[PDB]
């Protein structure tokens, strides 16, 4: 299952100044970028056009170009409309796309955040506020829902265009999406908060895809004190992760870090301290 996400970030500093920047993800791989200073959407993969013809892509891009300008003015007008309830500066984020399931099934979404809080979605045939949203948004929703043309366009984009486009992306991008990159590991140590304690660190870098197993071990005994950090990105669309273990000074000898990853083909990495 792959989630396609179009992420829009719009800053409105005051009545005059604004910028909108977008990035597009298929799973954890970036497929598009659209900078405020660019007239056109940028491909970040050879296969970012999917299976769309040039005419189909140009038409789709045109729709987005009209959208970006129209969106900017509409926010500025909505601020005037709700004045002086809401004032600049204002951040608006959109998360839109579709989740792809087997048997050509899919679910589409369009979520909107105002000042970093999820307040609005498109659902069915209309815009709606979500639980917890402030009541003043009811007027913007009324105004947005008066626009039958936008409603019809969004319905088509979410229901039809998104899944069709993404099906083609998955085909065109197969070899990148299914790439295997091997982890490399290395060990290190630092003093912890405790007085006479050490903190061993197993560094694991360069692996793709994300799923990985990393455990400190004394022989066949998995050390339960093992603490995985967060998954951190490398610049080359691989992943980095470190697993720590708080131990007593002197007890380092005997410990080893074992790494299991799909890319290694059963040949686990074992590093002895």
């Amino acid at each position, epitope marked *: 299952n792959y989630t396609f996400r179009c992420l829009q970030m719009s800053s409105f500093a005051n009545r005059s100044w604004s910028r909108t920047d977008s990035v597009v993800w298929l799973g954890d791989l970036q497929t598009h970028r659209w900078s405020n200073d660019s007239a056109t959407i940028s491909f970040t993969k050879p296969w970012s056009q999917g299976k769309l013809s040039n005419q189909q892509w140009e038409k789709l891009q045109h729709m987005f170009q*009209v959208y970006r300008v*129209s969106f900017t*003015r*509409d926010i500025q*007008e*909505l601020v*005037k*409309m709700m*004045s002086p309830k809401e004032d600049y500066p204002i951040e608006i984020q959109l998360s839109a796309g579709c989740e792809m399931y087997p048997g050509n099934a899919s679910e589409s979404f369009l979520h909107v955040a105002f000042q970093g809080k999820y307040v609005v979605r498109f659902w069915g045939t209309s815009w709606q506020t979500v639980p917890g949203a402030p009541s003043w948004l009811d*007027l913007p929703i*009324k*105004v*947005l*829902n*008066a*626009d*039958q*043309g*936008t409603s019809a366009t969004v319905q088509m984009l979410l229901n039809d265009t998104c899944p069709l486009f993404v099906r083609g992306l998955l085909e065109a991008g197969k070899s990148d999406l299914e790439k295997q990159e091997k982890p490399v590991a290395w060990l290190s140590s630092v003093p912890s908060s405790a007085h006479g304690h050490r903190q061993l660190v197993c560094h694991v870098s360069g692996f793709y895809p994300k799923p990985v197993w990393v455990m400190w071990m004394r022989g066949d005994q998995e050390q339960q004190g093992t603490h995985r950090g967060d998954f951190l990105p490398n610049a080359d669309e691989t992943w980095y992760l470190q697993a720590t273990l708080d131990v007593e000074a002197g007890e380092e000898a005997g410990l080893a870090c074992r790494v299991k990853h799909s890319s290694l083909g059963g040949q686990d990495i074992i590093l002895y301290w």
Partner: T-cell receptor
Amino acid sequence: KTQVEQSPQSLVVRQGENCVLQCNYSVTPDNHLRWFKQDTGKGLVSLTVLVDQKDKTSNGRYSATLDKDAKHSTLHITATLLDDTATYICVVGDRGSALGRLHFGAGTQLIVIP
Amino acid sequence: AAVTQSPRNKVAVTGGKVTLSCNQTNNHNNMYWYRQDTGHGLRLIHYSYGAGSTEKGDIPDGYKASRPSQENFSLILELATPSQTSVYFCASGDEGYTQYFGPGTRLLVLE
């Protein structure tokens, strides 16, 4: 100069003759286009509103077309009467809501000779 | 959905104060002031999204707008000039795109 241009600027027809009025625009986006009739020193009377990519409407002796790809509309008047003497104004609305701005043409002056 | 304007016709002198009024009982949030000059389409001067709201249009200079209530939207020429000789139209509407126009006001500013 402007985003909405009408042609001809003016015309004179004899009673019973048909005529065609043109509106060309550069407005983006183009949600809808309306034709108004304005009698001398009077107000704006809506004749028709066109909304579809390729639209056709009618209202008695008035009929209109819209081609959003060419950004072009025509108003046809069949069998002109003295009371058709007026200015005809093309307006493009850039939104399907109150967030829209209206973009007005400068009008075509029609005189019908009785 | 009806809209009225007062006065319907006004002769004023340069430097004098002129107030053009527009009333609608449609309970429309939104009201709009335009002027119509020969050789031009109607041009937006000021508009309002509700009582207390006034917003500049395309040609606001020399005009002040006032929205004291939902019903009334006024255009104020503080220091009238001959360039403000025109026909002025007010419109109202709700969240929909339709603007419902008043019958117009003719203003002549003499020297």
